[PDB]
Amino acid sequence: QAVDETLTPWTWNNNNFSSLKITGENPGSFGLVRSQNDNLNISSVTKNSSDDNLKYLNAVEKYLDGQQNFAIRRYDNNGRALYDINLAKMENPSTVQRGLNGEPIFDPFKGFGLTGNAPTDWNEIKGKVPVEVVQSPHSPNLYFVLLVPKVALEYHNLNNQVVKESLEVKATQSSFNPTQRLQKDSPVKDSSKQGEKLSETTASSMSSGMATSTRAKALKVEVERGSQSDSLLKNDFAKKPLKHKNSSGEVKLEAEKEFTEAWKPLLTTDQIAREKGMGATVVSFYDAPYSENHTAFGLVDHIDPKKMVENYPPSWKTPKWNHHGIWDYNARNLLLQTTGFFNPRRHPEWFDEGQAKADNTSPGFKVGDTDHKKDGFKKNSSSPIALPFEAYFANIGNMVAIGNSVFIFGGNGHATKMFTTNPLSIGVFRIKYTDNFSKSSVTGWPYAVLFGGLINPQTNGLKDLPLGTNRWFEYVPRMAVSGVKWVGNQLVLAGTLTMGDTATVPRLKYDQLEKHLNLVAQGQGLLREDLQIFTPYGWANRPDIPVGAWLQDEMGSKFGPHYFLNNPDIQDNVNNDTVEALISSYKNTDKLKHVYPYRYSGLYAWQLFNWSNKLTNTPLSANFVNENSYAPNSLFAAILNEDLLTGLSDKIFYGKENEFAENEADRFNQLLSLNPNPNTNWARYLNVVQRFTTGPNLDSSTFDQFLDFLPWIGNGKPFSNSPSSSTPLPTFSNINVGVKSMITQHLNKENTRWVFIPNFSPDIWTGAGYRVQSANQKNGIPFEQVKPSNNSTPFDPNSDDNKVTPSGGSSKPTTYPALPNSISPTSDWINALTFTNKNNPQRNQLLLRSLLGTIPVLINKSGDSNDQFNKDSEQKWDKTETNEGNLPGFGEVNGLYNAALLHTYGFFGTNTNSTDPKIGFKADSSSSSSSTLVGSGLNWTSQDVGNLVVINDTSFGFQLGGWFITFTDFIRPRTGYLGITLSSLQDQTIIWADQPWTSFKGSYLDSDGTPKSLWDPTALKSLPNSSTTYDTNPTLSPSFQLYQPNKVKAYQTTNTYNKLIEPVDATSAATNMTSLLKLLTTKNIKAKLGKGTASSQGNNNGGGVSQTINTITTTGNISEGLKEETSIQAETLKKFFDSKQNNKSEIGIGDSTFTKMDGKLTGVVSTPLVNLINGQGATSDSDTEKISFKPGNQIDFNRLFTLPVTELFDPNTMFVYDQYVPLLVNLPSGFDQASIRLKVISYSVENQTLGVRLEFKDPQTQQFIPVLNASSTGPQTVFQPFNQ
């Protein structure tokens, strides 16, 4: 039980927690420690055919019991280890001999009363490593230890055959086709159900209608209950004119042949619940640093995923459905995309069957039946959402206790994070305790109900985020945990969570799946990349048009008022006569809703502002929720009500509204609000989030100007590059890009001079990719965006149909005169909210993945000879309207400029490599251009998170990727402050290594006042094999994804982007771009860059400690940067940055200071005086070296009558009065009468024994502390005056 030098301090890569700063009476830390023994034969246990995962992991665990052990080495504020508590090899432990009502009997010296026998389940609990330990400050001297199974500890070393990556590679000795795993065949019209297409209404309802419209007339959509069990009388939604192309058989999503070797968990939710030894556990116990009974135990409690399963909203059981569930279901079928909102196909981590249900059948409702009315009634649901092994293990970590109850807020997933699959914590866990920690109940919640009550007024960051929800909890949050800490007087949760997917919110025209590879893959599930790609040509007029309303104009020459490819160049006016002529007369009742011929349109921004779950000032206000994203693309930091969370009840009951609509008759009249049955407690949990933030408290294009300012660790050069005429342009911010165009000439040309710009001259920068008539006239563009479907002449405005006639016959056109001058991938429009593209999902996701530093690129030419995108004569930045700017306009990630991005990277030029890599994008006009995306070389994944270091009650932070954020102004935001401060990382070898997160070994706050993080360059866990031994074109990595090809039509040399750049059928373009896909692998990327091996030079290994930059309270101030209403905030802060670009320190940008010390760094230990590193640095209270306990020599004793004592202390403050301080402790130095004190701990009237612990005003921290060198035994000492 004594200290064992063999075992060493460490820190697990799920929570990274081995040092709890203990305070109160016995400051120190429950030092978490493991043997530093390497050379562990993982391959010993073989997963044969007969054995299952359960017994295989049992064999692994028992073999490790025979090969490894763990203990918790409690530390003292001095830094002297006392005892370890080895769970495996501790003999005959005991729990506290509590009282009748539950109090623990603890004589300070005789110690906590033992029961002789410890909590049961020794066999299956001694084999669980301690990964975490927490303190309960409400109750006295209570402690927990988080027992996690060790298969997590050795998780990454198990045979890959069982733990299978989601992506399949095999030999694939045929180049590597990123599209050969994507279902690419488009839907087609059926040849047997022609007459069931949605039918145009019989006769328009005049209703005293004075307005007349020459355009096509609306569709009549109604569903009536009638009288039938499994059918109805008329189901207009269930019309399904389209069908899967019969190309080499049906094209459909079905796992049993779309996944030869499918992703699959290890242990199901029920399996882990029933199994005890393989599941986590939290144990209440008690520590006695100065008693012969050093340790005593309380209660042992398991964490049951059955509480997760029972506490999900009923709708979660049927994720393949959704609140819409009928038209959207059919659309997803036909477009070959996500079925539901959280199907396994796009998110298998949480499905206990894994990808085995990566299909469409069995959505909880009747589907596929011939008669359209028949489909829609509920039936068996075989695809529920549960907590499989990986997700459950990600659901453990950073637990904290409040009052009489404890919470486990989830791990971070690295322990079970494989190379591309991203599991994480989905639902919070709660534990309570009854009758003074005598019994407990295990319960857990879904974070969806925790986060349902979100509204923009809460956060000071970016607005309209995809965070809200509706009465159906088809929103699937999941937190990446930085460590919930009791920051000051508020409780803070920080890290990242997965936004509701804002990428696949648009849809694809039925005949446009073979030329939108980018987004079709981004949606189907073969592209786990969560940035958000820009392909505007093929979007629908509304993403939510029922399929039966798609073929009313199949040719598209008439331009399909009900359904047509989105192009707001033609968007109908919102003019009065226009609206009351097109939409009003088609009034919709409860039973019937009118799909209006009106030509809705708009670029991706308007598309999202309509059909994305943007946060509105009222919570529970997200009706259009498409899907939940891939991996955390949202930095997060919120404050969670301690008192409320304590109050909330364990079990959750759901009302009628929680489940889905019984039948489509009811569905047709869905509401966002309904009366919950008062006997249900689910909605109690709603308003728990006080606020939240993801980035600095900035809005609009100014936020992306900040994005421009932030630098890239891969080179350190910021994106702008302006300091030191065909020069690189800013990529994120469009300020000072292109030419200034007038919003006054945009669209209606009316009421715009002082609407979106508070200046006499509304001058804004159209951005890169813009077009204009000519240098003479730039503001606005005449309607030359005319789209001719066939060769039947252009869109034909002013046509009899295209012009409306209100009462009076004054025929007028419904399409606006002058359109905006940018539909670029970086299109920026404050006014044309139907032509802008810089949405807040863009802004936040780019913040996250640019702080990570792994934003993708789009390329034409690799570094190959004769295929080199050289700089001179083919990169003319000043001219970006023509092909000289090399702007693709199709396949690039929305919100940035490809040429500028690649200059920032250094793929061409000296920015990255000594020799120009000769990799870049050309806007070739000779013929069609093939291209794709690739990784950034870096591999800082998104689930990355540090441990939340609480700097003070007003700020905090952690490390994210290679950067160190600090929420400087989140708890107490201040006007004019940027909001956050940043610190970068120095070690290049650490930066570029394969898996740079087998390097961070926990974070803490250094006593000096600035946190740090550990780095172990020798611990870099790269890929298991160098593509075995043969070079595999596809080689996995944290941030490797199937970036599909994008092949585009030829570009017109001049006036390139009048219209959208049409794509060509790129399905079979993979084999012709082998060189381009060679760069899709990070290893090849770094090989080209010249930093593929240790050739980067510099630090040999760089094993040291990195410290974030010191932040003045004014750090991050942009007070002068803002305002200046002479022009817009974006441009004024751009000028501010250009005046302070070379002062990254002031803004909050820097590189963490690094100190090199030799050693096999593995963890840290914490004492309130100072946190020590790796368990070294023994201290002996240097300041108070010359003070010790006075032996019995300086006591009366001798032989006299029973000594009367205890009169010198009172039921008041129990410290001995100042009269008799030095009677027991030697003070040859500290003779001062203003310090040096004592603290009694117990006594006995009839025996006269006195027990005290010294207490003195600590200089460094003005807090009263105990002392160890007082006596060899310890500050606690009995003073018994024997007997006569």
Q: Which of 856, 862, 1044, 854 is nearest to 934 (CA)?
A: 856
Supply 959's token pair. 């490390």
352: left (phi over 0), alpha (psi -120 to 50) or beta: alpha
Q: Return the SS3 of 645.
A: helix
CB 1099 within 8 A of CB 989: yes
- Classify the phi-psi angles of 354: left when phi > 0, otherwise alpha if psi is within -120 to 50, otherwise beta: left
The secondary structure of 400-425 as a DSSP string is: EEETTEEEE----SGGG--SS----B
Residue tagged 């612990």 (tokens):
1253
**Residue 595, number of CB atoms within 10 A of its CB:** 23
829: left (phi over 0), alpha (psi -120 to 50) or beta: beta
Q: In whole angstroms, what is the distance from residue 676 CA to residue 574 CA?
A: 38
| Helix, strand, coil percentages, rounded to 5, for the chain | 15, 15, 65
For residues 716 and 984, the answer to whether their CB atoms sit within 8 Å is: yes
Return the closest-CA partner of residue 968 out of 947, 945, 950, 986.
950
* Residues contacting residue 999 through CB under 8 Å, at least 6 positions apart: 990, 993, 1014, 1015, 1016, 1017, 1019, 1020
Q: Distance of CA 1084 to CAs 165, 369, 749, 1046, Å?
A: 21, 49, 52, 20
Q: How many CA atoms lie within 13 A of 1244 on its CB side?
A: 14
Say if residues 280 and 147 touch (Cβ distance below 8 Å).
yes
Are 615 and 455 a contacting pair, CB within 8 Å? yes
- What's the gap between Cα 1025 and its chain centre? 29
Tokens found for residue 42: 């993982």
Give the closest residue to 493 by CA, choosing from 483, 503, 502. 483
**CA 1207 vs CA 717, 915, 1168, 1221: distances in Å:** 72, 85, 34, 14
In the chain, the amino acid numbered 1182 is S
Breaks in the chain after (C-N > 2.5 angstroms): 724
Contacts of 168 (CB under 8 A, 6+ apart): 181, 259, 260, 261
Q: What angle do CA 765, 766, 769 make, to 5 degrees?
A: 135
Continuous H helices in 1209-1272 = none
Tell me the C-alpha distance between 839 and 566, whole Å. 18
Q: By C-alpha distance, which of 169, 183, 349, 200 is closest to 250?
A: 183
Give the experimental resolution in Å: 3.7
CB atoms within 10 A of CB 669: 12
CA distance linking residue 406 with residue 134, whole number of Å: 10
Cα 842 from Cα 442, distance rounded (Å): 40
Q: How many CA atoms lie within 13 A of 390 on its CB side?
A: 27
Select from 41, 20, 38 the least CA-distant residue to 29: 20
Q: How far is CA 3 from the centre of its chain?
A: 40
Q: Is 428 left (phi over 0), alpha (psi -120 to 50) or beta?
A: beta
What is the spatial distance between Cα 406 and Cα 922, in angstroms, rounded to a whole number? 58
* Backbone torsions φ then ψ of 496, nearest 5 degrees: -140, 155
Number of H helices, E strands in the chain: 21, 46
Backbone phi and psi for residue 1221, each to the nearest 5 degrees, phi listed first: -70, -55
- Tokens read off for 243: 């069908």
Q: How many CB atoms lie within 10 A of CB 379?
A: 12
Q: How many CA atoms lie within 13 A of 494 on its CB side?
A: 30
- The structure tokens listed for 907 are 């793929």
Phi, psi of 1136 (to 5 degrees): -60, -45
Which amino acid, one-letter code, is at 398?
Answer: N
Which 3 state secondary structure label does DSSP give 1013? strand
Packing angle of the helix pair 701-709, 1129-1140 (nearest 10 deg):
20
Nearest of 146, 143, 142 to residue 130 by alpha carbon: 146
Listed residue (769, 475, 720, 479) closest to 613, CA to CA:
475
Three-state secondary-structure class, residue 958: strand
CA distances 1062 to 122, 188, 874, 889, Å, are 68, 21, 23, 9
Helix pair angle (840-852, 701-709), 10° resolution: 10
How far is residue 608's CA from residue 789's CA, in Å, rounded to a whole number? 26
End-to-end Cα distance, the chain: 39
Instruction: Please count the other Cβ atoms lying within 10 Å of the Cβ belonging to residue 466.
Output: 28
- The two most distant CA atoms of the chain are separated, in Å, by 124
Distance CA(814)–CA(582), nearest Å, equals 10
Sign of CA dihedral 300, 302, 303, 306: negative
Residues in Cβ contact with 730 at an 8 Å cutoff, skipping those fewer than 6 apart: 708, 719, 720, 721, 722, 736, 737, 897, 900
Closest by CA to 267, choosing from 410, 391, 428, is: 391
Q: Which residue, 445, 908, 976, is CA-closest to 702?
A: 976
Beta bridge partners of 402: 405
Instruction: Choose among 1153, 1161, 1158: nearest CA to 985.
Output: 1153
Contact between 517 and 179 (Cβ < 8 Å) = yes
CA torsion through residues 253, 254, 259, 265, sign? positive
Count of beta carbons in the 10 Å neighbourhood of residue 220 = 18
Per DSSP, helices labelled H in 1141-1195 are 1144-1147
CA distance 611 to 74: 55
Q: Which long-range contacts (CB under 8 A, 24 or more apart) does 707-711 make?
A: 707/732, 707/733, 707/843, 707/846, 707/847, 707/850, 708/732, 708/733, 708/1134, 708/1137, 709/1137, 709/1141, 709/1147, 709/1149, 710/850, 710/851, 710/982, 710/1149, 711/984, 711/1144, 711/1149
Instruction: Please tell me the distance from the alpha carbon of residue 327 to that of residue 317, in angstroms, as a whole number.
Output: 20
Distance between CA atoms of residues 430 and 422, nearest Å:
24
Cα dist. 1126→104, 232, 735, 746, 759 in Å? 70, 63, 15, 21, 6
User: What single DSSP character describes residue 258?
Assistant: H
Give the contacts of 566 (CB within 8 A, at least 6 positions apart): 506, 536, 539, 540, 541, 601, 602, 603, 607
CA–CA distance, 463 with 608 (Å, rounded to integer):
13
Cα–Cα distance for residue pair 981/1115, rounded to 1 Å: 7
Q: Tokens 């080689």 identify what position? A: 1035
**Residues 945, 947, 949, CA angle at the centre, nearest 5°?**
130
CB–CB of 1109/1152 below 8 Å?
yes
The four Cα atoms 1187, 1188, 1191, 1194 give a dihedral, to 10 degrees, of 20
Q: Interior CA angle at 193 toward 189 and 197, to 5°?
A: 75
DSSP calls for 868-887 = ---STTT--TT--SSGGG--
Task: Report the distance separating Cα 439 and Cα 455, nearest Å.
Answer: 38
Within 8 A by CB and 6+ apart from 764, the residues are 740, 741, 743, 757, 828, 829, 830, 1128
> What is the arrangement of strands in the sheet containing 295-302, beginning at the earlier edge strand?
128-136, 142-149, 281-287, 295-302
Backbone angles phi, psi at 244, to 5 degrees: -70, 135
Query: Strand order of the sheet with strand 592-595?
Result: 234-235, 219-224, 592-595
Distance, CA of 7 to CA of 1162 (rounded, Å) = 12
Sequence length of the chain is 1284
Contact (Cβ atoms closer than 8 angstroms) between residue 635 and residue 694: yes
Q: How far apart are CA 877 and CA 884, in angstroms?
A: 7
Give the count of beta carbons closer than 10 Å to the beta carbon of residue 776: 6
Which of 498, 507, 451 shows the shortest CA–CA distance to 626?
507
Helix (H, G, I), strand (E, B) or coil at 1164: strand
Q: Any alpha helices (H) in 303-352, and if so which ranges?
A: 305-310, 327-335
Cα-based angle 1085, 504, 167 (whole degrees, multiple of 5): 45
Q: Are 245 and 251 in contact (CB under 8 A)?
A: yes
Q: Residue 277 has what DSSP assignment?
A: T
- Reduced to 3 states (helix: H, G, I; strand: E, B; else coil), residue 58 is helix
* Element containing residue 849 per DSSP (H, E): helix 840-852
User: In angstroms, rounded to a whole number, what is the distance separating the alpha carbons of residues 810 and 1011?
Assistant: 72
Tokens of 1172: 């020590």
**Could you tell me which residues come within 8 angstroms of residue 213 by beta carbon, excluding any fewer than 6 positions away?**
581, 582, 585, 597, 804, 805
- 1159: closest CA among 952, 1015, 994, 946? 1015
